[PDB]
Ligand binder design. Structure first.
Ligand SMILES: [Mg+2]
Ligand SMILES: [Mg+2]
Lengths: 235, 239
DNA sequence: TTTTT
DNA sequence: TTTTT
């Protein structure tokens, strides 16, 4: 099974899972965006298909009362940011078309984030993947607390459109790279959903995996054992 | 077991991190470190106290069948200004010591305003549900936290809530409670409520009625799916 | 290659 | 009945 290949190293969680052609997604009825998406890449799999034949549409195999709509994002000020990236899925027109499901979208800052630094992170994972045995990428939104002036910690985020789609404060990305058979490089990033200077290197957004777990309420690469991790966030 | 099937007869609100305790079912949210929902089932017979039971020798503690890193602890609540508010109320579970002890799992707790809410109007709503249930054949109650949007001083909508303790336990902005009362066999009265997690003044609990649909949308849950609307004879006091 | 009323 | 040192 493709899906069982994609999810070899663990399910981050089991809420409202859909297995699409080339990735697995978990959808959150409350925020109207994904809990997470998992992707599996090989050099083989990263190689006629056109993407502007694609239009974002709701995945209606989820109940309608829990759907986002293009009308939620329209004039929001945010892009429809695709967590499982179209560029990662080009072995078929279907596979790429499903990356355009709104279940796979989060409201993302456009210029200075989704169109730049977040895009740079995606391109980095793709390029590293092209010279690795297997690559596993888990992406998801976050809603992080901030201490404010009264000394109290608050989670605050905008919601948009009539369906109140959540605007994540941050996004995480965790990549597992099989370098030598049975052995892995692990890269864990948290980036703010905000304008980021192009000056900043992606490694500045490294965080320990445990931080991603706690913040997202997910078990990332549980089925995997830490002996087989040879490199962690560069080290 | 067969008990959990009686409890969940009219459907699962969701399937995330479900635990079946002896007399109620709970769904646990790893992000908020509190419940998504709890579902309870009462009857007049089950509201008779059993002998030897006692709620005085009960202490709040985590349910460690969830992974440690997603638990809340008593230290998260300690000196926060909020109560450990039981969603499935101790008072609903009368038939054994374990059944009531389990309502003291922290998975069943939300940070709640005490004076003016948990100890007052929220408790008034709980007692009201037990009272109605002594006169009904079957009663199902679904309870949970909400985190609701507020139009701020720009023109943008925001969800904002406090998190407490080192584990960042969410302080809900509101709580819903939906009660399905079987008034005659196969015929139900439905009552849906949303209250703010705040001091509530004289205010009748019926001021907090909202359509079921509004609770489903806010909570991202499917409440009482296996219930045919033909069978509903009353909705928040009407019809 | 990422997207926008 | 609810809870908190
Ligand atoms: Mg993107
Ligand atoms: Mg209480």
């Amino acid at each position: 099974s493709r899906s069982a290949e994609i999810m070899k190293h663990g399910y981050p969680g089991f809420t409202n899972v859909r297995t699409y052609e080339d990735f697995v997604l978990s959808y959150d009825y409350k925020t109207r965006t994904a809990h997470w998406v998992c992707e599996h890449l090989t050099p083989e799999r990263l190689k006629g298909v056109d993407r502007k034949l694609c239009e974002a549409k709701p995945d209606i195999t989820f109940p309608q009362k829990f759907l986002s709509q293009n009308t939620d994002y329209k004039c929001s000020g945010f892009d429809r940011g695709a967590l499982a990236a179209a560029g990662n899925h080009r072995k078929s027109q279907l596979a790429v078309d499903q990356t355009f499901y709104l279940s796979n979208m989060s409201p993302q800052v456009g210029r200075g984030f989704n169109r730049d630094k977040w895009n740079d992170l995606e391109m980095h994972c793709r390029r590293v993947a092209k010279k690795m045995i297997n690559s596993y990428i888990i992406t998801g939104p976050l809603y992080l607390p901030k201490l404010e002036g009264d000394g109290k910690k608050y989670i605050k985020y905008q919601v948009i459109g009539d369906n109140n789609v959540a605007v994540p404060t941050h996004f995480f990305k965790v990549a597992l790279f099989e370098v030598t058979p049975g052995k892995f490089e692990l890269e864990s990033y948290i980036l703010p959903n905000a304008v980021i200077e192009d000056t900043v290197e992606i490694s500045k957004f490294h965080v320990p995996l445990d931080a991603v777990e706690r913040s997202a309420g997910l078990e990332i690469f549980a089925r995997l054992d830490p002996k087989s991790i040879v490199k962690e966030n560069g080290a």
